[PDB]
Structures are given as C-alpha cells and as structure tokens.
Amino acid sequence: GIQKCGLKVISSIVHFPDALGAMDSVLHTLQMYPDDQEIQCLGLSLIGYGHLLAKILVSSLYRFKDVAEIQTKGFQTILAILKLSASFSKLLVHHSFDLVIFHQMSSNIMEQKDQQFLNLCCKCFAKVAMDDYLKNVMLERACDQNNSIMVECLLLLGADANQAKEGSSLICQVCEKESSPKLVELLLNSGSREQDVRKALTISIGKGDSQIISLLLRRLALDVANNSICLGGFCIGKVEPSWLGPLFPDKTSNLRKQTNIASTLARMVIRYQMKSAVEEREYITSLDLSANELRDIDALSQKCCISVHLEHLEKLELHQNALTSFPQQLCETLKSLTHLDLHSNKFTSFPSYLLKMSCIANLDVSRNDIGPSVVLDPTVKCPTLKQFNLSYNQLSFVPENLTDVVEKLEQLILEGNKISGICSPLRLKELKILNLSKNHISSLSENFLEACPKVESFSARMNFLAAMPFLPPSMTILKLSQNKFSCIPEAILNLPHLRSLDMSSNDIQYLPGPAHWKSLNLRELLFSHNQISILDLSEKAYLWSRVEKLHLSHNKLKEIPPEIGCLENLTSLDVSYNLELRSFPNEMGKLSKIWDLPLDELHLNFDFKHIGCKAKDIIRFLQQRLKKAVPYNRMKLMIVGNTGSGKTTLLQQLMKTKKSDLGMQSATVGIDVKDWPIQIRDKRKRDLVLNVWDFAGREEFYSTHPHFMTQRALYLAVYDLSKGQAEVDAMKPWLFNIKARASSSPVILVGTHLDVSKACMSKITKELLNKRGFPAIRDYHFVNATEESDALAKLRKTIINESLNFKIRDQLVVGQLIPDCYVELEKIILSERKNVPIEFPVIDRKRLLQLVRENQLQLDENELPHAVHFLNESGVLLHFQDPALQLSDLYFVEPKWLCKIMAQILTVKVEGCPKHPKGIISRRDPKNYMTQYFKLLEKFQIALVPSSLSDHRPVIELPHCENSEIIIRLYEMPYFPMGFWSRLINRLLEISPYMLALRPNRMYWRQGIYLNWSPEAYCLVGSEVLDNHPESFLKITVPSCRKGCILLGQVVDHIDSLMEEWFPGLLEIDICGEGETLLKKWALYSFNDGEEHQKILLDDLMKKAEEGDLLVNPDQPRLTIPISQIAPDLILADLPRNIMLNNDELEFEQAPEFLLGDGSFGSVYRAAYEGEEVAVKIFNKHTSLRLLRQELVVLCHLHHPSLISLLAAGIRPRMLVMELASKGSLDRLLQQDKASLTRTLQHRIALHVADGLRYLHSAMIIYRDLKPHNVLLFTLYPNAAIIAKIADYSIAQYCCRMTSEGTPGFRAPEVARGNVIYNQQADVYSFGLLLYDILTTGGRIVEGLKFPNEFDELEIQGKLPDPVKEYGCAPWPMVEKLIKQCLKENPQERPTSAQVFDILNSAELVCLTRRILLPKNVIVECMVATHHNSRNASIWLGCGHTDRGQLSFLDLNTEGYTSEEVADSRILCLALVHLPVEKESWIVSGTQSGTLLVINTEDGKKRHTLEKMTDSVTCLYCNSFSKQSKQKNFLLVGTADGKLAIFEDKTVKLKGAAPLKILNIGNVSTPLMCLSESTNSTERNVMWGGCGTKIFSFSNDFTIQKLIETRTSQLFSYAAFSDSNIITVVVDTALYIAKQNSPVVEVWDKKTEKLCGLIDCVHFLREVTVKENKESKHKMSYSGRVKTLCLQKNTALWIGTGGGHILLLDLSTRRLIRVIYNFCNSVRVMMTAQLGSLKNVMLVLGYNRKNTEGTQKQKEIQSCLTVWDINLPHEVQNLEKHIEVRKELAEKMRRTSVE
Ligand SMILES: Nc1ncnc2c1ncn2[C@@H]1O[C@H](COP(=O)(O)OP(=O)(O)OP(=O)(O)O)[C@@H](O)[C@H]1O
Ligand SMILES: Nc1nc2c(ncn2[C@@H]2O[C@H](COP(=O)(O)OP(=O)(O)O)[C@@H](O)[C@H]2O)c(=O)[nH]1
C-alpha cells in the first residue's frame, strides 16, 4: 500500500531534473494495485512521459467511466501518445476503446458546461479515426450496440456503410439486432446498396416490426415525386396496413431538431482534424403489389390506419399473386379506383360486386380460373367500365347480363376461354375492340354483331369458324386467323371502311380481285398458309394503291401477276415458301417502298443472296430489267487434271489455236485463264463465250484451286489414259473435289491419249465412277489431244450441247436475262483491259467510277456493288469484297495475271541452306508491290508456307493416352478435299486466345497441328487411316478434363463452319439411294475405362437422337457412360459451366399460351427457375444445334448491368433462359402507360441505354437496331439500380447468322441508303431517335403507325420537327441540344457513345426545366413571380438597358415578352403585393427618381404614384403580418437612407398612401441593399434586413431589437471583404451574409451574434478549376463574387458567383456538393417560386455576353433566364450514388466471366 507515495514522488521528480526502465514498473503497478482511484490518476498522468499500455488504459477508463476528471488525465495521456506515435490508435481501437469513447461522448455532455473536456475528447477521436479502415471498424463496432448519435457522427465523417460482408453487411445485421428505427434510418439515408436492403427486408419480415419495414420500404418502394408505391418484385408473403402506414403522406408530420448534437460533434472533430492537418394533401395513387405472393389480402379490408388514404387510390395492381375472393369490404372503401388489374391469381368466380365501385375502368381479371358461368348481377349498374378483360379463364358461356350492366364498355376481351355454343345477340352499344380468339366457337348467331354499331377490332383467332354475322359498317381491323375457312365471305367483302384483315392459316381457295372489296382503304392483307392458286389483280389494280402489306407465303402460287407494280404504297411483300414461282415480273421494280422481301425456299431467274440481296437490291435489279434487258452469253469451262495430261495441249485444239507457235510448252503455274468465243454459225446466233481455266495439276498448288471452283461451271476432266485403269482411281480426288465444291455442276471425263494405245477402262468408269458419291458425269470421251479429229469435234459439240442446256433449277444459266447495265459494264471492262499497266493491272475504285462517268452508264453508287460482283462471278474481273481483307478498293482486271502471281512463290524453291524447318520462311524478295504481294497471300492465308510443309507426320507422345482421359471424334470422309488442311490449319492457327492471351507452343506438320499449353490443355488434330480403309480419318484427341472440352467444342466448330462454308456438297444428304452424307462424323468411346482394347464407333447423328436421356449404355444396361464424356459439344458443357440447364429446377410449361404473356403471340414464355422468375425463349426447328451453340459462345461473355444476361441454355427442348423484364418492353409502356414516365425515369432509361451502348461499342459490336421495342424495363421506381436493359439476343443472332438495315422508322441516314458500311455512329443516331421518342412519349410512333412512309422519309434526313412545338411536353432543353447533336447527318459529327453517356451523366441535365432567351440586349436587375395564380405564372422584369423606367412583362408557358414603358427613371427592385379581396395582386415599381409607382396586374393603366421617398429606393418586400386577429399585410419600402416605408395591404390602392411607421435606420451613405424574413413562422416572422454594413432585425414592433455589426470582425483576413456594402441576408439557424465584391460569406448567428463560419467561394472553385482551367494561372485577380443568395427549405444553399457559376452548399454537414458552370456568365438575380402546380423551382437570371465587338468597347449581352428544379441538390448526389452502384455491379458481373 505504498505505491501512492512512490508515484507522487516520481511525478514530482519526472518534471524538475528532466528525468530519463521505469515504464514497465509503473505499468505493472496498475495491475498489481487495481481499482484504486487515488493511484490510477497518479499513474495515468505519468504514462504521458507491447500493447499492455492499451490493454491497461482501455480497461481502466472503462472501469472508471464517469468517476471524475481522471478521464481527463487518461485522454490527455492517449493524446500525448498519438501525437508522437499515431499507429497506436490501431491497437486502441483493437482492444476496447469504443466501449469507453462512446460512453464519454454520450454521457450527457450536452447541457453540461464541460466543453473544455469534450474538446479534448473530440480532438483525440479525430486522430483515432484517421485511417479509413479504423473508421469502418469503429462503425461496425458502433452498430451492434444501439447508439444512434455516435453512428450518425461516424457517418458524417465518411466511413461508408456498405463494406462489412456484402451479403451480411451493416443493415443486414442491424435489422436482426432489434435496433432502433433511428439507427436504420441513418444507414439508409446515407450510402447503402440496394441488394443488402432487399435482404434485410426479408429478415425483418421474419420478425414483426412495424417501423423497421416501414423505413425499409420508404427507401425501397416510394416514388414520392410521382405518387406511387412500386412494391412489385418483392416476395413479401403478406401485407399489413401497419407497414404502409408511414408510407402515405400526412401534413401533420413536423419535428424538432435534436440531431444537431451529431452535427456539433462531427464539426468539432473535422475542425480539429483540419487544424492538425494543415498546420502539421398530395394523395399518392399508384399502389403496386404485383409479385408479392399474396395468399389473401383481407388484411386491408379492415378499418385500418390507412383506410382513409385508400379513398383516393385510383390504381391498384395485384397481378401474378395467389389471391382469391377480393374482400367485400375493400371494393367499397376505395370509391375512386379506376385501374384494377389482378390476373394470374387463383380466383374461382367473378365476384360481380367488383363493379359496385363508384368510378371504375380497365377491370382486368385475365388469367384466373373463373368458373363456367360469370352471371352478372342484374341489379348492379356500372356505366363507367371501359375494358372488361377476361382472357384465358375457363368460361363456357359469354358473360350473361353484359348488356344491361356495362353499357359504355369499349374493349370486351374474352380470348383464351372455351366459349363453345353459338353465342347470343350481345347488344352492347359502345364496343370498339371485341376479342374471342382461341375459343371453341363453331359459328356466331347471324344477329351477333347486328346491334353493336361501333365495333372496330373484332379478333377471333384459332376458332372453328366458317361464317360471319353481318359485321357493322364501322369495322376497321378484323383478325380471323387460324379459323377453318374456305372463302372470304360476303360479310367481309362489303365493309366500306376495312383497314386490315388477318386471315392466315385457313385453307382458302379464292382471293378475290380488288373489284370485290368495296373499301377504298385497304392497308394490310395477311393471307399466309392458305391454298391460294391465283393472285387476280388484272381486274382493277389502282383501288389497292394503299395496300401496305401483302403476305401470301405458303400458298400454291404459280406466278406473280405483272399488275403488282401499281400498288406503289406496298411496303412488305412476302411470297416465300411457294416453291412454284420460278420467276419475278419486271414490273415489281416500281415498288420503291419495299424494305423487306424474303426469298426463303424458292428459286428465281437470278443469283441472289451473295452477301447482300437485302430486298432493296432486288428492286433495283427488277427495275433495271424494266428499262431494257439483254440475254447474257457467258459461262466457265474449268479444266482439271493431275500433273500430266492433255490440259494445255487439249485446250489448244478445243479453241483451235491454229499457230501453236510454242514448239514445246511446259507445266502450268497457277490456272492460266483464257477466253474463247463461239459465234455459232447456225439458225441461232447465240454467241456464247465461255472462259476456260486450265488448272495446274502439279501437286504443290492444290491449296489455291478451291478458290476458283464455282458452281456456275461445266468442268472437264482428263485421264492421261496412257496409264489405263490406274489413273481413273488416281483421278477420283478431282471428281470428289468437284462434288464437294460445286455439287450441281456436270463433268465431262476425257481420256486424253489414244495416239498411244487398253481402252477397256470404260468398264471401271461405268461401274465405280458414275453414281457413287461422285458428281453428275454427263459424258466421257477419248480424244487424241494433239490434232483435229472427228472425236475431238464431237467433244466440241458435246460441250456446246451441255452448256446450252446446263439449266440448274430449270433456269438455262447460259441464257438468263440481265439488265443492259451489266453487259455495258462488261464491254467497258473488256475495252479497258487493253489500257492497264502489265506490271500492275490492278484498278482502284476511283478509276472505274471515272470510267462510268466517261461513259453514259446509269449506275449509281448503290448499283456497282452488285454490278462488279455479277461480273466477278463470270470471271471477267476479280474483286474481293471481304471487309477483313482490306483491299476491296482494288479491281483486278485480267485475272490471268493475278492467278500467275499468287502462284509464283509456291514454285520458287531454295537449293541453298535449310536453316529453317521445311515450310516456314521469312520475307525475302518491286517498288511497294512486294508488301501487297504477301498482303494478298496472307489474305489468301497461304502465308510460313502451309504448302510444301513436312508431309511426314512427326511422332508426338501425348502425356495422357489411357483410354479414359482422352476424347476422340473421327471424321471419316472419302478423301481430304483439295484445299482442306491449308484452310483448316489456318483457322485453328490464328485463334490464339483460347482458354479465354497465353499462346501454346505448336508443332504443325502438313496435316496436323498439336498445339499444347500443358499436359491438361492440348489438341492433336491428326490425319491417319485405319487398316483396311480406303477413306481418310481425321482423329482429334483432347484431354477429357473440363478445359480440354472447350478446345474440342471450338475445333469441331471451326471444322463445321468450314465445311458448310466451302465444301457444301459433302454434308448434303443424298436422299437418292441412302443418306450416306459423305461425312461420317464418328465418335469414339469405350465402356471399360482403360485397356478396353477398342473404342466403339457411334455415328454422331444416331447418337444425337439419344438425347432424351443423358446416359449412353449398351444392350447390357448395367454399366453406362454419360454423354458429357464422349461428345461434350452436343451437350452445352464446353461453354462456361454456369450455363447448364439443370432441368430439375426449371419449372416451365411451354404448351399453355397464358404463360406466353411476354410478347403478343411471340415465342418467349415466362417461367420459374431457381425458385425465381425468368423468361425462357423456346426456339423453333429452324435454329440448328450448331448455330445455337455458335450464338451462345458470343452471348456468354457480355455480362453488363444494362444487357439481358444469360442464365441457362440446354436441350429438351432447345430453349434459352434469360432475365425476365417485369414491366415488359418500352413501346407498350409509352403506348398505354403514358402517365408513368416522370422526367426522372425518362432520364434513367436514357442513361441505362447509353451505358449499354457505351459497353457494346467497347467490345467493338454495334447494335444495328435500337427502338422502343428493344428496351425492356424492369421497374418504374426511378431511384433503382437496374431499370432499362436492351435485349441483346439480336446482336448475337446477327453476328452468327449475318433486318441488318434496322427497322425503317428507327434508322440512321447512312443506314437507310446502305451505300456505306456502318459504324458506332449509327447506334448513336438510333439512340437519338429513341431519346426523341422518350421525350415526346411516343408521339412519333403513334402518328407514324398511320403514316409509315412519312414516319421514315421525314427522319431519313436530319429534319425531324421540334419535340416541343409539335407534341405537348415539358421542354427540358438541356437534351434538345443533345438531340440536335445526335441527329446530325455527318456520322463523325455525332457524339460517340462515350460522350453521349458522359453528357447524360451530368445532373444539371435532369433538373434544368426550361431556359428562356430574353430579347437581344435586355438588361434586367429585378424580377418577381406570381404565385397566387397556380394555373400559370408570370415574371415581371425591370429595365437596365434604358435609363428611363420600363417594366417588362413575361409569361412562362407562352414566352410572350411584353415591353411597356411605365416610368422615366431606371428601376431597381420589385415586389408583388396580393390583396385577398377583389381578387387581384397589385405590382410595384421602385424607381431611382424616388417615386414609388404602383400598377395593377390586369390593367396596365390604373397606376398611381405613392408617397415619394428621398433617394433611390433599393429593396422591397411583401410580408405576412396578420397580427390583428384577421388577415393583413404590409409593404416594406427600404430607401437608400434606411427610412423603411411600411404600408398596409389595402391602402396601397390609395393615391399617395401612408408610409405607416418610417424609421431612419442608417445614413444616406449607408445604403439599404437587402431585406428578408425568418425561415419559420413560429417566431412571428422576424424580419432581418441588411443595411450598408449594418445588419438589423425586428418584428411587429418595427423597431431595432438587434443592430449587429459585421465590419468589426476579429477574424480579419482582409478588410474590404468585411468593410463593404452588404448584398443579401438569409435567416435560418445561422445568419448568412453577402457583400459587394466579397468572394466570401460570413456565417453569423442570431443569439450570440458571432462569426460562426467563413465559407470562401474560390476555396471550392480553384479546386475543380485547376486542370480544366489552365489559363487561370495568369488570372490571379479572380472574378466570381457573391451576387445573390437563396436558401432551399433546409437542404442546401445556392450561391451565385459573379461569373457563370452557381454553388450548392449543404448547410448542415458537408459544404460543397457541386459547381454548375458554363451555362451563363453572371447570376444577377436569383429567387425561388412555384409554377403551375409544379411548385418549388429556382429562377436564375443569368447573362451571356460575347466578345464579337469587344474591340468597340461594347458587349453583346444576352440575359438568359433559366428555371431550375429545386430538387437539384438531392438529384446530383443521388445520381452520383446510382452511377457508382452500377460501376460496382459491372465489376462484379465482369468477375463472373472469369469464373
Ligand atoms: N427477358 C424478357 N423479359 C420480358 N419480356 C421479354 C424478354 N425478352 C423478350 N420479351 C418480350 O417478348 C416479346 C417477343 O420478343 P422476340 O425477341 O420474340 O421478338 P421478335 O424476335 O421480333 O419475334 P419474332 O422472332 O417472332 O419476330 C417482345 O415483345 C419482348 O418485349
Ligand atoms: N505424244 C503425246 N503427248 C501428249 C498427248 N496429250 C498430251 N501430251 C503431252 O502432255 C503435255 C501437256 O502438259 P500438261 O499436263 O497439260 O501440263 P499441266 O496439265 O498444266 O500439268 C504436253 O507436253 C504433251 O507432250 C498425246 O496425245 N500425245
């Protein structure tokens, strides 16, 4: 017990002699003598002179929480420790330091004048929370224990609240700990992601809390600005009024301000941190309850707390719930419901008391299981109902008393039911859209529609119908598809207003000519799937001049009559799948409006589908065939041999080359193209000229031949018969190649030696050769091939007769008709062949385009791309339109040069040094031609020489070859086609980023690659033949691990996308005989894993059919192999493993259509997956498995939060799972829910679409079709995370199967003409059109649905009208500039997608409501609004451009500027006094001459001059001073001497009224320059005016009760900033001051009257204006001075700089929010107001001056009035949060692509 004296003497001695292992003992003595207060302090005060220090400090301070000021000693010790070793805070916070510091800063220190201690404590905490992680852990450790004050103080200091665990983060735990609602309200109102709030919602549903949910919902589902409750997607199993209670608004909500404790603490901590850092009604209507699986809603049918808000509901949604029997009490409580839709619920009978609501419409119960009869109560009258939707129930009879109940019904929908018997009269008076589709209706009673004289859209599909009951003469749209009709009945022929007729799928016989329709306004005639033989139109065609769509597909058509050219307005003709047309009439060329015209499954009189043929080229072609056509006489006679033959020695005698001057020719290089014409001296003068291509036979060029083997050809073939019956076998590779490349081309075998002998090989040529997989042999001769003889003349005659009768698809190719333009261009190319340099006969596009100008060819830029191609086919000039092959500008005339050049490197060998392995080479050679040489070889992939490359295969020893880890898939085919491997080993080669950029070391011989990354990732695409096999197998070995399969699925894809691209004859099922298919893609597997001695063959087709299961097994079913080990491509297991279907969880029923709700009779259904809702997209039989697999590989790696993300994909059936967009596409939204778009959701959709485009264009892929049908919303709650999402299946479907021009209306100008290839600047134009249709809310779409030709051609140039003048809409004029930017014709003048997103992100785009350009050179220093008229307001202005008085009226909705001189002296400021009697509001004129002039609002003549003051009046005000037990008001005229002229509200009418109580306040040289009023009305409107430099205040006394001075400041940094004239003052919890040229505001107070704050402007400007403003370095004499103040209610304070800037200061916690520059030049006057029920706007009267004539010392002023949305300070930070959240989501989604 002696330690006390010891420590006392140590404390005495540690001070005087400057003392120098004591600390260990003084630490231990605490634990040896604990709890003794007298020695605790003696120790701690000495510690200020191993974490045991912390371990004993925190525990001591905890055990001595509030004893006395030993806490002062301990905290002094801690601070002394930190200021030398700051990292000790990491250990303090580690042990317990929060448990003591929170109790300290919460031990009722407020109201305790112990501030000297709290200052120390906060100074310490400011350093404890230096590191960000320390803050984020102090927050976590402050949220467990319920401590609202400290958790808010920690939030005001940063310390984000979305970092704890991201699945069990702050709120996720806080909701479990039964926290206080005030604690959750602080986490929510600060930064907090949505996905965690949604999880916490469920947790707090688990418990019963009526204030933690009601605060979670208010941030999850409440669009307060739009009066909505978007509670849809939540799986809230129940609904309680105690939850929605505080959601509804109520006026009685008003509170005190007690959180200022947290503000004080946070500001003191921040101050110490900085000092340490620098030195050292409005009833809401929409109530959405869609996805909440409500099993009953009776909880609302009580007398609950919200039973008063329901009487103004006006919309209620309950669709997709599990309800039943809508409660009786409810449907009577809400007496203003006008949109009740509840479908997909499990109802059982239509209540029929639902109609007992007062004013209802759009009653929608349209997926329930309503019973057979729906008998309606004959005593309830509901004449308000419009749309009685009842689709997809189990009805057996039309509603019973429909007539006498709903008279004014408009669209009775009854589809999907089973209405069976012949219906009833149904005398409804106001129907407009009937609907009875998919019922079982045999026939209608012939008086059915006889009494509904307004029907317009009768739609009865899929019935069993044969007759029509006298349709009313007002019929417009009539859909009768899938009926069982035979003839268009007379009831449809006689409708004098018909406008559309959908009668597909009926076995019709007679489509009547236009002389039987009696309706001059046909627009659409859909007639697919019928049996229509004739297309009678010759009768009278011009009556149909308006038919815009004529679908005749799948009929028995024979020809299209030539009268079809009269229907000029025809837009989309369809005659596909007829298979018996065979010819198009040349009159179709006049249908200039056709934009799509399919050619599926029919053969015509021309070659189409080249790379274009987009239904627009066909119109030009058939129009040019209308000018003048000439038969085309030219074919290709390709020769083929092998390395020795009569090829160049037989050709010389076919063409009868008389000279043969070359005494001895040599082997051919290349192909040696020639021409030879045959003017047949006969009765027929057809001078056919066919160009032979005498291919080279030497075995080294073979990989370049398959380029020049086309289908329009009549191949020869030569044996060199000298080697009898041995070459016929040795020549079969050539015939096989001919069959592979050009299946439908003949052959003429020619044994080319009889001068030397064994011609019995005719037997073998007849037995093995004629009809076994080989092409259609058409003859076989035995020429001599050196001299003319009858045998060779018979060969010439055979060639003649075969060419003139080639006739593919019965077309007679050598005599088809073509436009004269092509023959003309051909003659010009032949004439120009003679005038080109031999060393470089290439021609550039410009020179040819000059040749056509020289001639009179009528070809335009849209004509040549077909012209040169059709002249390319005929072998006249070679052109390569492959865009990847960047040489499309070159036009190779005389191909016999290019073909010899491309083959000259393949013969130059080196007899030097073989330093490189055989086949690899470097660049060894002329002037700039050598570069293009191997820029063409590589373009042909012949570059590394894939020819002459190591024929011998090297023995490679793969690591794993144990019959169980290897996957093999043979490819048995008769022979390798000619240019197969050099094509194949060049497609697998250049794919380096496998396993996606790590390339493997490859060792490739001629016929194999073996690229290996490692023993687990390799691939050997070999080439060997089994024993006893005349074929050649392509073994592909791959390790069966998961990584390996990717390789397998990627190589089978390359070897299939090649075979159908180059050799379509192989994989062509020869139905004749048997489907040998010429390509047996075997698969190898063995049940006995390892040492099975064999792998059992199994055709891949026959195995594909065994996909009903997943296991393959022999006839002995005990052991089995999974399919995913023998063919991992058929099962989608090669692609990222996350996209396997997992059918055990996918709950989905294709068969029903009421689940097809996604899209009107589309193909995508709605289903459940992983217990969640998704949208599966069933494909039809068209999409082959390979093509679906090809689209999935590109779809699987987009993964953006603005793109429909893939979820699964499988077989049984071929489906595709994607995310479900709840609110459907956008076009339906803006077509039927136009009141939902709310000027901040219209912006969120645009932002999300711009983000989608900015991400697509990053991956170098353009969308090509962006229209309101491809934008799929997800929720209508604006401040959400994911709202819009562009459907991305289209881009994959295109990039795989290459509508390519886009929808007509939503299409760029560069895209409609099609002349040029597109760019990222076409999606931007389409996005601009999307923005114009969002702004006008789909006005252009609706109007263009009746003017499509003008819906397209008006916008095909950048000439679309003004969104405002045409369609009524809010101007929102910071996007009309964005539109006028994105709607330019020059593509690179349109902003790229990154900009159009980065200028959509600006939060002054969503808040600038309208900018109003004042007239040129109008100077106004005073404005005033009109608020007593809430219908429209006006802004009376003054005049500064004249020294004579003039007030300037200005309306707002009309922008009608009215000028009226009303005085003789410059006006300074105004005020608007309203008088509640006589219904007017007089306006005042304060003039510099001193006359107070007043004029009335309506009459501009009842003007009377008030009492004249002394000097220039400077400020006025209209008060709220009703202290006489009634309503009363004054006017406070403040002269430039202080003599405040007060008045009375009604005496102002008096000529020269009485200034009531005039007080001389200041001096004539101390000018009054402001006047204002308190913020609340509780203090009885205490007025606070500035005066010169003297600030005062008063009340109903009108006497100075405060005369505070501001010049006398003890915070002098500069004098004139404080010693200058005051400008404005605003009154709140503090006082804010503005002075002339004073760039700083001084925060004064009411009571203490002290400088509570000094807030500089450029201390915010010069922190953003650092790098973006470089010239400002010489601008040290900075401009920008406070010219005005205006305080938002309690959120922020707006400071207008003298420059063009405007500040947003959150007065409460954080100062700078944003700086909104570059919209004006001087914010001269700023005020708040209310405009047309959209109250709370912030007027800003800016300037705009241009130095056009600044040299004349004159400036061109443009006073730019704007109208900001006062909710801007919330918007800017909410958007800053919403963008960061989507960045964080795009990152998490980009991590999913990795794994
Ligand atoms: N993920 C989704 N969520 C919600 N709705 C969707 C989704 N995907 C598509 N839809 C809707 O389904 C409808 C059908 O879309 P689809 O892609 O089949 O159109 P389409 O390709 O033009 O049809 P078709 O191929 O028959 O011409 C569209 O109207 C679209 O709004
Ligand atoms: N003696 C003789 N020689 C022939 C006959 N037919 C072709 N040839 C020879 O075949 C050679 C033609 O070369 P060719 O094989 O066509 O060149 P390649 O096809 O491009 O490889 C000539 O040199 C002729 O000598 C023939 O009937 N009699």
How does this structure look, described?
The chain is an alpha+beta fold and 1795 residues long. Among the domains are: 3-250 and 261-275; 475-604, Ribonuclease Inhibitor (Leucine-rich repeat, LRR (right-handed beta-alpha superhelix), Alpha-Beta Horseshoe); 633-654 and 666-815, P-loop containing nucleotide triphosphate hydrolases (Rossmann fold), CATH 3.40.50; 950-1061 and 1121-1134, 2-Layer Sandwich (TATA-Binding Protein); 1221-1400, Transferase(Phosphotransferase) domain 1 (Transferase(Phosphotransferase), domain 1); 1402-1458 and 1680-1795, no CATH class. 24% of the residues lie in helices and 13% in strands. A five-stranded parallel beta sheet has the order 5-6-7-8-9, with no helix packed on it. Strands 21-25-24-23-22 form a five-stranded antiparallel beta sheet, with helices on one face. Strands 39, 40, 41, 42 and 43 form a five-stranded antiparallel beta sheet that branches. β37 and β38 (1457-1460) form a beta hairpin. The longest helix is centred in the C-terminal third of the chain and has 27 residues, at 1768-1794. It starts with a helix and ends with a helix. Bound molecules: adenosine-5'-triphosphate (ATP) and guanosine-5'-diphosphate. Guanosine-5'-diphosphate (GDP) binds at residues 641, 643-649, 665, 667-668, 696-698, 752-753, 755, 784-786. The PDB classes it as transferase, hydrolase. The entry lists the keywords Parkinson's disease, microtubule, kinase, cryo-EM, neuropeptide, transferase, hydrolase. The assembly is monomeric.
